[PDB]
Design an enzyme around this catalytic site. Sequence first.
Site, PDB file in Angstrom:
ATOM      1  N   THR A 151       0.835  -1.205   0.000  1.00 54.59           N
ATOM      2  CA  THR A 151       0.000   0.000   0.000  1.00 54.59           C
ATOM      3  C   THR A 151       0.869   1.255   0.000  1.00 54.59           C
ATOM      4  O   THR A 151       2.055   1.197   0.326  1.00 54.59           O
ATOM      5  CB  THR A 151      -0.951   0.054   1.218  1.00 54.59           C
ATOM      6  OG1 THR A 151      -0.190   0.153   2.428  1.00 54.59           O
ATOM      7  CG2 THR A 151      -1.847  -1.184   1.276  1.00 54.59           C
ATOM      8  N   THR A 152       0.271   2.385  -0.362  1.00 56.77           N
ATOM      9  CA  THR A 152       1.008   3.640  -0.480  1.00 56.77           C
ATOM     10  C   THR A 152       1.260   4.259   0.894  1.00 56.77           C
ATOM     11  O   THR A 152       0.363   4.310   1.734  1.00 56.77           O
ATOM     12  CB  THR A 152       0.254   4.653  -1.368  1.00 56.77           C
ATOM     13  OG1 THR A 152      -0.139   4.021  -2.595  1.00 56.77           O
ATOM     14  CG2 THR A 152       1.132   5.865  -1.683  1.00 56.77           C
TER      15      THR A 152
END
Lengths: 195, 244, 243, 235, 250, 241, 240, 231, 111
Positions: free
Chosen positions: C30-31
Site C-alpha cells: 500500500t502507499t
Amino acid sequence: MDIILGIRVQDSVILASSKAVTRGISVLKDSDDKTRQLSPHTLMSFAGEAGDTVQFAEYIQANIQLYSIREDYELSPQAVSSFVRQELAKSIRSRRPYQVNVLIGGYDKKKNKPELYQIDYLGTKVELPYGAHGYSGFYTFSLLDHHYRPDMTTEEGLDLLKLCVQELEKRMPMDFKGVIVKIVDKDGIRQVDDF
Amino acid sequence: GSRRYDSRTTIFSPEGRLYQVEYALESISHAGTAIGIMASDGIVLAAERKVTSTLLEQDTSTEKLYKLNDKIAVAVAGLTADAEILINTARIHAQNYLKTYNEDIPVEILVRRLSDIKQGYTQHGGLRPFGVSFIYAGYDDRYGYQLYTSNPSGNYTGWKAISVGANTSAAQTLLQMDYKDDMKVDDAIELALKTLSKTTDSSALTYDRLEFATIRKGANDGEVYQKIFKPQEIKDILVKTGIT
Amino acid sequence: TGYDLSNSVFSPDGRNFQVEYAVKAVENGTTSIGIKCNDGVVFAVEKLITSKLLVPQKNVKIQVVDRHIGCVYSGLIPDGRHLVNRGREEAASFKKLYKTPIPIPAFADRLGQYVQAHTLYNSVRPFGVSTIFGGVDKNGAHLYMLEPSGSYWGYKGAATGKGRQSAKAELEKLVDHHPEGLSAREAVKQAAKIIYLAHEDNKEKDFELEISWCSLSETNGLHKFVKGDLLQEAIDFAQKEIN
Amino acid sequence: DRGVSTFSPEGRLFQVEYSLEAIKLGSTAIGIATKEGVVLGVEKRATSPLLESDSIEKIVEIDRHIGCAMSGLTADARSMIEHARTAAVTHNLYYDEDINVESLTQSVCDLALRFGELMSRPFGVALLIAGHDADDGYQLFHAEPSGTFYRYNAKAIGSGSEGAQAELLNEWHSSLTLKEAELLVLKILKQVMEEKLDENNAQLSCITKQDGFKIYDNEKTAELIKELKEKEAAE
Amino acid sequence: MTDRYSFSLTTFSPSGKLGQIDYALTAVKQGVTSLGIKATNGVVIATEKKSSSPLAMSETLSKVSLLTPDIGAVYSGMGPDYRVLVDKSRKVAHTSYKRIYGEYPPTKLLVSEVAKIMQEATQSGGVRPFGVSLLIAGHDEFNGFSLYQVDPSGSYFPWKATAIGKGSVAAKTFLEKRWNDELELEDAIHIALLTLKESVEGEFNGDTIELAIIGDENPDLLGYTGIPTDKGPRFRKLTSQEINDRLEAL
Amino acid sequence: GYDRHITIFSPEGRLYQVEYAFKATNQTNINSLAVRGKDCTVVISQKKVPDKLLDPTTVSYIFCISRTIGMVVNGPIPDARNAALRAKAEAAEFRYKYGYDMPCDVLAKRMANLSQIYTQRAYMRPLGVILTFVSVDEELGPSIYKTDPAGYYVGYKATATGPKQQEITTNLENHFKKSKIDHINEESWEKVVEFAITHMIDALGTEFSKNDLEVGVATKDKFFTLSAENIEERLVAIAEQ
Amino acid sequence: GYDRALSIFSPDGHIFQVEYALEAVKRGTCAVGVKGKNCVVLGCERRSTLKLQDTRITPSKVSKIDSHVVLSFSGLNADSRILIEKARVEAQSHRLTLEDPVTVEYLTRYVAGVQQRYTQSGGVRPFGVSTLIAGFDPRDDEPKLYQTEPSGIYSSWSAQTIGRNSKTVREFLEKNYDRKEPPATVEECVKLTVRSLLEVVQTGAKNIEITVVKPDSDIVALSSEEINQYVTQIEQEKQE
Amino acid sequence: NNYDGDTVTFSPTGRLFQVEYALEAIKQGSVTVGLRSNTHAVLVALKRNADELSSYQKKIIKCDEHMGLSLAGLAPDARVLSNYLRQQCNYSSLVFNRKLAVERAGHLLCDKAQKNTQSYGGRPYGVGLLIIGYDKSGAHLLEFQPSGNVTELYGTAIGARSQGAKTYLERTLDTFIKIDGNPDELIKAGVEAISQSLRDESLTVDNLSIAIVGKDTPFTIYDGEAVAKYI
Amino acid sequence: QFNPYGDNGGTILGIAGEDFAVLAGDTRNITDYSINSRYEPKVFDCGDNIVMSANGFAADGDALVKRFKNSVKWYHFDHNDKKLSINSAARNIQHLLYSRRFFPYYVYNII
Ligand SMILES: [Cl-]
Ligand SMILES: [Mg+2]
Ligand SMILES: [Mg+2]
C-alpha cells in the site's frame, strides 16, 4: 583411613592394610579391605580422606581394566604406577583434589621381579623395598631398616611384617583392628586368611 | 542457503562405498611408490621421489620418509602437506604416551590412533579426507619388528612386506615371489631396491630419485637404531646391490 | 544463470537480484508517504479495507521509535515491524550510553547498516519493505527513506508503495510552489490529499486514512497521531480536492 | 538438495509424509479399548526361523498403568520409550501420583517435530499408547511422527492397517468384554498376516486397573488362539 | 548469520584431482615471474614490480618482504593473498617459536608453519586455497643458507635455485645452465638479473625490479650497539641505485 | 557453474564474484579524483542529485573517518557506509590501543585485508566499492591510498576512479610528465583544489556549477569537506583566468 | 558445526544412507555365530587376496568387549573400531556404577543404540557395520548370541551369519541346525561352524578363524592346526 | 518453482512461496469462526475426526483467564505458539501484575512468526489462529496468519469453506455487535455463522466446540453435552 | 557486608479436622523493633481448595507462594484442568524449596 604397609621381598610383594572404618566416635566396620586389584599381577592399597579413597581406586581400576581389554596385554607395574602418579599430580591442582595416598604392589612378568611403588596424594612417586603412608613409617621403618634383606623369602617377609604390626599395636594410640595381608607374586594375587 | 554448495564428503554410494575415500585412493595411486620389507633382524623402508629436478637440494629434502620417534618411522604416499599434519599429531601422541606410562608407545597403538583420526574424516565433520597412505616401520618389546599400512578409509593392516602408491599391483607380485620368512636385512634391502627398479616409471633408478631407511637391532647390544640414508649412502648401496 | 537464486551473489552486471526482487514486494504494498515541513515532519499511509469486518482505527500501521521518531513502511508488514523493533533497541542503547535521544541522521544509519547487513549473506533474506521515517532533533527536522538494499537519503518529500509515482508527482509540486516552506498544519492537509490522490492506483477497495506528525511548535518535538477533529478536517480537505 | 523442514505446495512437510510411508512397511500392531481394559497385540514377523522370536520386543511397558506397541522403524522407538518412561517416573517424583495417559502421550509427541538443520529427521515409527487413569479411565492413543495424536476406541497400524481398520469398524462396540477384545485382536491379526498366526509369531498384552500392564505368555496366548479356532468353526 | 559453510570447498574428483588446488596453481602461473638463487655465502630472491598505473607509487607496494631478521619472502600469483600470509608468517614466528625459545625460528620450520596454514585452507570449511606460490630464502646457525618453495597445496621443497610464475619453465632452464656449487653471492645476483631480464617486457631498471638478499650480518641496520652477540639482520633489500650499478656490469 | 556464485577458483584461476564486485563500483555513475599538494591532499568527486525531492545536503560519497583521514567511495551507498563505519571504528580502536593516530596507509592496508578475507571466505561477499583514503600523514606527508574488492591496495601520486577514470588518469599522467614532480607545486590548498577541478573539467569535457561537485581537503592535523559556497568561490577564481 | 542431515527419508519411505550402509556390510567378509548347549562359537572369514600379511599383529576379527563378552563384525573395518571402543568403555562404566558386569543383552542394546543415533543425528553417516555379539551373563550358564545392524535394530539368534555370501551359509544353517537338540559339545558346535564357512570360504587353510566362548569368562581362539583338523575330517566324511 | 526450496528466497515477483505453502495448510484445516460484541467474545470451531473409532481433534486452547484461541492447520505448531502466549501472558502477570493486552499479544505472535520467515534452516508456522480476549479496553478478536500478519476484527473465519461464514458475518455485522449482556445469543450467531461453511456433515454433540470470554466471564471451553443446547 | 536475609516476624498455625482444615496467621509485619504494617496478609488461597502460608523472611515467602500459585496454573494447562490434590501440591513444593538447597527460601511453610 589409617595404616597401609608394603614390603618387597625376593620373589613377591606383600601389602598389609588396616581393617577399621570410623565415623564420628564409632567404629562402623572392623573387616574393611582397603585394596583393589588393578590387574592379575598388580595390587593397589589406599588410604586418605573418607569416600575419595574408594572412588579414586575404582576409577584407576576401571582405566587399567580398559587398557587390558583394548590391548589384550597387562601393563607393567612401572607403567601403572606412572599412570596413577599423573592422575594424582593432575588432581592436586584441581578445584577439589582427591586426598588419597597409595601403595602399588606388582610382579613384573617380563623382568621376573617384584616391585613396590609408594605414591602420596601430591603425586610423589618412589620405588622402595618397603614403604608406608602417614604415621605408620614412624613406628615401622626402624624395624625394617634393621631386619630387611633383599633375598628374604615370602615367609620371612610375613614374619617381619608381623613384628611391624605388633610394634604399631603397642605404640600407636589408635586401634586399627588388625590388618588384611595380601601377597603378589608370579602366580598372581592371594590373601593370607590367618594373620 | 549454504546447503546448495555442499559436496557431502561423508556419504555412501548406492553400492556401499565411500566416494571420497575411493577418490583419495585414486590420487594415491599416482604418488611415488613406497615399499616396506620386514626381516628377522630389522625392517627396510624404500621410497621413490617423484620426477625430481637437478636444481632440487636433495640432502636437505624430505618428502617420503619421516621419523615419528626413536623406534618408529613412516613412509608417505600421497599429499605431503596432508601427511605432515598427521605426522605431527602422531609425534605428539607418542610423547603423550611416554609422559603417561614412562614407556615408549607400542607400534600398533600409535597406528590405531592415526587410523582412527582418518576414520573420523570419513564419518563426520563434512570435510575431505586426508589423501595419504602410510607404511609404518617400528619396533617394541611385545611383538618386535612390525610393518603396518593405513589408508584414507582409516583401515590398517599388518604386513611382512608391502607397497603403497603407484604400481602396487606389480610391486606386490614381485615381493610375494622373492620374499621368504628367514630373510635378513641385507637381503631385504636388495629386494626393496630390485622391486622399485622394475616397477618404476622412470628410465633408470638413480640415487637422487630415492629415499631409503632401515630400522636395525644392528646397534651396540640390545637396542634399536634408525638410519635415514644420506644421498651418498644411497649411491653406495645402489652400486653394492648391482643396479648402477 | 542462477545468480538470482541466492542472496548476496553478484550477477555479471554487478547486481544483487534478490534485493531487486525484495523491491517488487515493496511495490506491491500500500502507499505510504512522508512530508518535511518548517519545524517538523508529517507521515501518512493508505490502509486498504479488505472487509467490513475490520475494526476501524484499530489496525495501526505507523509506529513510534523512542518518543521523537515516526516510522511508516510499505511492503511486507512483519518485516517492517522487525526493523522497528531493532530501531527501538538501537535508540535505547544510544540514549543509555550518551544520555541524549538519538539524532535522526544517527538513527537513519543504524537502520541502514542493519538492512545492509541482510544483503551480505545467503543465510538471510533481504527486507521486503521500504521505510519512510524521521522526526525532530537538536539540529531540527529530518525526513528519510530507506530501501531493501540499505540505501537511504534525506528527503524534502518521500513516497513508496503501489501509488508512489502519483504521490511523487504531487510532492514535486509542493516543493516548487513553496520554496520558503510549508507549515505543519498545512503538511497534514496536503498529506491527506496525496494519499487520496494516490488511492486511484488501489481504487478497487475503499481505504482508511492514517496520519501522524512530529513538530517543534505543534507537538513539542514529540511524535503524535493525528486524531479527532484535526483528522476529520484533513479528510474533508482531501475529499474537497478530488471533487 | 532441499531443506529438511520444507513445505510441499499442498501444505505438508515432505519428511513427515515420507516417514508415514516407512510406517506402512512395518509389521501390524492393533489396539482395542474396552471398559474392562485395553488390549494391545502385534505381529512379530521374524525374518528367519533361526531368529529367537521371544527376543522380538514390539510391545513395551512405559509405567505400571501405561503400555505401548510400535510399528515401523522400531529402532527409532527406543529413545521415545526412554523419554516416556523418564517422563512418567519424573512426574511421579514431582507430584506423588500416576501421570495421565494423555499427558504422557503429549510428552512423547513433543519430540516428534524437534527436527531440522535437535535430531536430523522425524521418527520412522508410529506408537499405540494404551493405559488407564482415574480421570478419563481406559484410553488408547495413536502417536504419529507429525506430532499429532488421536484417541481411539480401536486402532490398527502397520502394513495391514486399512484392511484391519475396516474390520475394527464393524466389530467394535461399547459393551465389549476383555476376553472378546483379546479374540478380536487375534482374529484380525490372523487375517492380515502373511504367515499362519501362532503363539510364537504373534504377541498379546493388556492393561487393567487391578493388575496393570501385562504381556501375555506364549502358553496363555496359545489357549486364546485355540479358543478362537473353535468358535469360528462353531458356525 | 553465522558461518554456515562448515564443509570443505576443496574435494577429490573421480580422477583423484583436487580441483581448487589445481586452479590455484593456474592462478600462480598467470602471476608475474619471481625467482630465487642460493650461493655459497648467501641467497638472492627477485621479482618484477609490475606497476598497475604510472600514477601509482610502486615503492609503497612491497613484493619482497622481511619475515624475520634472517628470513625473507617473495611470491607469484595473487598479491592480497601473499600480504595476509606475510602477516600470519611474521606472527607465527613469534607465537609458536620466539616467545618459547627466545630466538627466531630456522628457515625450514618457519616454512613448515607457513605451509601448514596453506594446507588448512585446502581442507578446512568454507574457504578456498591461497592463490600463491612462495619462495622463502633464509639463514640460520645450524642449517646455514637455504631456499624453499611453498605451493597452494601446502607442499614445500628445498631448492638450489628456481623460478615460479609466468616464465618459470624458461627461467628454470636458464638457471640450470648457470648454477654451480661454487657461486659467490655477487655471481648469484648477476645471474638473477640476467634470468629476470628474459621475462620482463618493458623497462628494466632499479625502479621496476625488486631484489633482496640473505647474506652477511648488517650491524649498521641493527639500530643499537653494546651487545657483541647481536650482530644484525642478514636480510637486506637492495636499493634502486644498488641494482642499477650492477646493470652497468651486465 | 557454482564457481561463479561464491568466491572459489574457476578453472582459469579467476574469482568471478570479485570481478563482478568491481563492476558494481560504477553503478553510481560518479567520477572521483585525488591529487597531492605541498602541504595538502585534495579529493574531488562529482555530485548528482537527480530527484528534486532529495535533500541535497545528505547526498554524499565523502566521509570523515578520523580527524586526519578522509575517505571517498566509488560504489553503492550501502556498501560505502558499511566500509565507512568500519574504518571509523578501526581508526578509533587503533588510537586507543597504540597511543597514536592511525596512518592513512595503515588503515588502507587494514581495510584491504578485510576485503581479502571476503575473497577467500565463502559466506562473506565482497563489498562493491573502491575506497580512496587521503590525509597529510605526520611521517609520509600528503598521502593517497586506494583499496578495491580484490583486497589490493597501493599508494598514489594522484589517482582517479569511476566510469571515465582512464580519461582523467591520462590527463593527470600528461601533467606529471611535464612538471617531472610527484605533486602539485602550490602553497595554498585553495589553488590545489582549483587545479583538481580544472583538470577534471578538461578530462571529462563538462562544466561544473557549485552543486555539481563535492570536495574534500586534508591538511596537517585535520580533514574537512567544502560547502557549496566554498566551491563557488573556487569556480569563480577558475573562470577569471 | 557441520549439522547437515545426511540420513533422510525418501518419497517411498526409505532411508537410503542406512540401506547403503547395509551394502557395505554385504561387501564385508563373512562372519558366523552358532550357540551350542553350553557354549557359543564365532567363525570369521579371512579373504586370501591379502598374502604377505603378518598374522601376529593384524587386527583380529573377533574382539573382546569384556572378559565374558565378545564382538565380531562384517563391513567397514575402521567403523567397527569406533563401536568396539565405545562398547569397551560402556562395559567398564557399567561395572563402575552398578557393580555388575554388563549382560550380553545390555551391551548389544547399547551398541545398537549407538548405531541408531548415527541414523538421525546431523552431520554424520551411519556405521557400515553389522555385529554379532556373544557371551555368557554373570553367574549364568545359558548361551547368548545377538545381532545388530546399521539401522539400530537388534535381536537374539540360535545361529546367524552376516557379510558376503551370508545368504548361502544362512541357508546351510537353517537346514542343519536343530533347535530341539543343539550342538551338545564344543566339538559339535565348532564342527558345524567350520562346515558352514566351508560352503563359502574357498580354501580351508588360513581363511577360517574360530573363537570359542564358554561360561565363566572362558574364551579361547583356535589355532591354524586345530582348525585344519576339522577341515580334514569334514571333507573325508564328504567323500562318500 | 526454483524459488520455493526455502524461506530465505524471494521469487522474481517478490513472493515468498514457503510462506504461501504454509498458508495453504490452513485452508486444508477444519473451519473455525470468531466473533465479538462490546461485552463478550466468542470462538466456534468445527472439530475433525480421523474415522468413527477416533476422537475429534481439539481446536480451542486456553492461554489465560482472560484470553485464548482457536486453531486451523498444523496442531503441533498451535501448541508451540499457544505455549508462547501462555508464557507471555504469565510474564506480564508475574512481573507487572498486569493482564496482557490482546493487541500486544498479537504483536508478540507477529514478531515470533516473522523470525521464521527471514532465516535459513527453519520454517514458517503451518497454522492460523483466532485469538479472543477481554482486557481493559473491552472485548477483542484477532486473526493470526503465519506470514506474520495479525489483524483485529469484529468477526472472521478461517479454514476450509471459511468464505461462507465470513460472508454471513459481513451481513450480520450490525446485528451481532449489538448483542451486549447476552452470551447465549452471541453464541447462537456464531453457531449460525459456522453453519454456512458446512457441507454434507452437520453439527453433532461431539463435533461442535465453543469458547467464550467476557466482562464477568473467564475464558471457558464448552464440549460434549455442554453444547447440545446450541445444536 | 550485604546480608540477603531478613526476619519479618509473624506466626502461623494449621489444624486438621475430620472433614475440614484451618490455616491461621497474624497480620503483623516487622523489622527489628519497628512495625511495617498492622495488616499485611500472610495466608493465601492458592486455588484448588488449597491454602498456603510461608512465614519467616517475607520476600522469600512471597516468592514461594507466587511460584506455587504459578505451578497450580501450569498444572491445569498441562494436565487437562485436573485438580491438584493436597498430597501432590506438597510434593511439588518440596522440589520448589530444594531448588535452592544452597541459597534457601528462609521460610517455614504450611499448607
Ligand atoms: Cl589486518
Ligand atoms: Mg611418598
Ligand atoms: Mg565470499
